[model samples]
Target: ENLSDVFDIYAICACCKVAPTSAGTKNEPFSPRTFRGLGNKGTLPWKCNSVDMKYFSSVTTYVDESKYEKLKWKRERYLRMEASKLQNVVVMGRSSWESIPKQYKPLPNRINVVLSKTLTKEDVKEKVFIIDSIDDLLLLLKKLKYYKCFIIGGAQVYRECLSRNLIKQIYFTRINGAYPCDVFFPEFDESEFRVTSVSEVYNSKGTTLDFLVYSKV
Candidate 1:
């Protein structure tokens, strides 16, 4: 309530002007899923403690000579439609935000956060929050005391959060056919997550689909 300038205080929160404490002494370190950071887009983000919030990446895929070539599919889209009814925050990369038709965004009725170090409130057409970076994201999530947030993405944002070990659960919807692909979903370390729940097979038009939820190992 006492914030004089919220947006001004949020961005450029910290820039590693001082040397960091030792990388917290782990006995063994594994190569990260991501090899770079958003700030420079070619390096890692600052090493710091991050809030452990449950993350669910909701994605649907169309498989072989059927759904794409024969069968087809939304009053609501995949897991995204189901999850949106829960009132949780939905964070995305700038590209994901752009991919949606202008009418379907501010993404309807949820808290939409677009990750972009360069975008501000004035720069958007949709009514949403513009988070600067992963650090700023961590800070905001903690302040809101969010129990869980969904990484609704365009791969880059998903990788960013997954790279930081922020995501724990995944909402994977597997369809029956494989459609052509240009862009792709970045891979996360499967060993770190395990399937915890599964949903009933859904018949969307003629494409058979189901959701699988995963938890951290």
Candidate 2:
């Protein structure tokens, strides 16, 4: 009945510094001081905590594992759509795509979609779908049968999706701290959502992280 029925978006939100963390400070890759001012100059301010990374990977790649056999059998006989196309999708901006290491370029077990004006199919490797705009992505999604869609973001993309009210659920990884971050996750109407589940606090490397799920009300 709504766009929310189509995509489940996720992001990590954290307290950010209004300005750059520091000038000429070597940006650390996967530093573990977990905070969400998303990016401090083109990199994370904290190291990657195994717990946070694992949770993000699991949720984005999750599927009804046991139902696949039955689904493939029924779809092959009835719908004629390839069962492999039923995998979940993670959509992000070009910067987000580039932020990932080359070895992990195309995140496994899910479809990688990058929204960009300067990127074309030739610029990216095989199996990476490039859509110029969100509007086009929506049209294509309607014509295809994907299991789930996530807006794994880089600020502006998240703003666009939220403004359009295209997100239904948010898997928010809240890391406790105020870090120097140049960008931030876009804020939404708090009155419109309610916390559904919160995981136990994970304290690592002297920082605490919490996994919170917010469902639209």
Candidate 3:
């Protein structure tokens, strides 16, 4: 029962419909539907990674370099929510936590973690919880046994995870809704994973999108 040495950590994010300079990544509007890479906004940190992490981007052959399945934040994530309805936890940065509408503050049907220094245990629990620092969060993660842990983010948290070599897969929803966005997903190293499928594009709630999953190589 002590399979604690390793587990998978995947990330999910949406873009501002059609690879824009910004993003509209909050999962919403789409009820059932669904992309990525290093960009100007993503941490794309090579400064502190291992030799492998730093060399990852150079080996483009590991992943399918040509795929446009990038912007399904709302509908696609809703489906992921349904799929993991019984078990799964989502970890997000503090800003991402604040972005959730108060009504859905804790996010339904799943356990969650917000990497925030502002919260105390009494102030957080159930569907939603708070983690004060990466060291504490890593310790907590080491103890849990779950089907999956998805990093739903703001930039810093994802960057931190990448810096620590903690993230391994990505479930990105490629979108074409084109909304204004100031925030951005942290750029990642593609040499880390390989795309498993082409893409399944669809339309939902006036948004056009698709989805893809890349597994760590």
Candidate 4:
């Protein structure tokens, strides 16, 4: 089942805004459409598809416990649905792995590989496999016979893959408006990739988001 030739990398992230506010504000986060406008101007390239962890931390602090749980449930469900469609590997950085709740560990039907120079075998135990180098990762991927390698990341990991030109397709999400954020995704040259398709979705609460698929030419 080795798929040495299928080394495509897919990147996914949400497009949101950068706002300045404290807790308990009634402000709505930035939308995908609005973020796209900012990106077109090259003003907010990093913040478009990715957001700062501080924003989510603040959100966790301000949101009602019950409501936050519900929202998290839906988000996890969405992620699982996407994961089920992959026949290859799911690669992530150590921080991203730590951010995942224990209950959501080991996505079904795919090997979960975490990249870290610091994680020990004792740290991961049998819970997940750890890879320390790109070479080692490629070897392990070859063993797994993966058709594709999906790069699910926070920010740094995505940049590493992009710098290597290892990514083939990117699945990105954009929120409608802007919100405050500290971290962001890397700025990509549009001339290097082409948009394949886009799908829009809105929750019952009127929260809107769009999924964009891009392929390298």
TM-score of each: 0.58, 0.78, 0.62, 0.65
- Off-target runs (Cα >4 Å) in candidate 4 are 1-5, 21-86
Give candidate 3's whole-model lDDT. 0.54
Candidate 2 vs candidate 4, lDDT winner: 2
Ranking by lDDT: 2, 4, 3, 1
Better of 1 and 3 by lDDT: 3
lDDT of 4 by residue, 156-197 (tens): 777777776767777776666655554566765657779998
Model 3 lDDT tens row, 118-217: 8777865545668888777766655653445667776778778776667767666555544433345565576776897546666555555566677766
Against the true structure, candidate 2 reaches a TM-score of 0.78
lDDT of 2 by residue, 1-217 (tens): 3555533344333333233334566454444433346766776656666677888888888887566566445433443333234677788898878888989978898888889999877768758889889898776565555566788877888878888777777787866666667676776675777999988988878877788888888
RMSD of candidate 3 to the truth, in angstroms, is 15.3
Residue 196 in candidate 2 has what lDDT? 95
Number of the top-ranking candidate, with lDDT as the measure: 2
Better of 2 and 4 by TM-score: 2
Better of 2 and 3 by TM-score: 2
Give the root-mean-square deviation of each candidate in angstroms: 16.7, 6.9, 15.3, 13.2
TM-score of 3: 0.62
Give lDDT: candidate 3, residue 157: 81
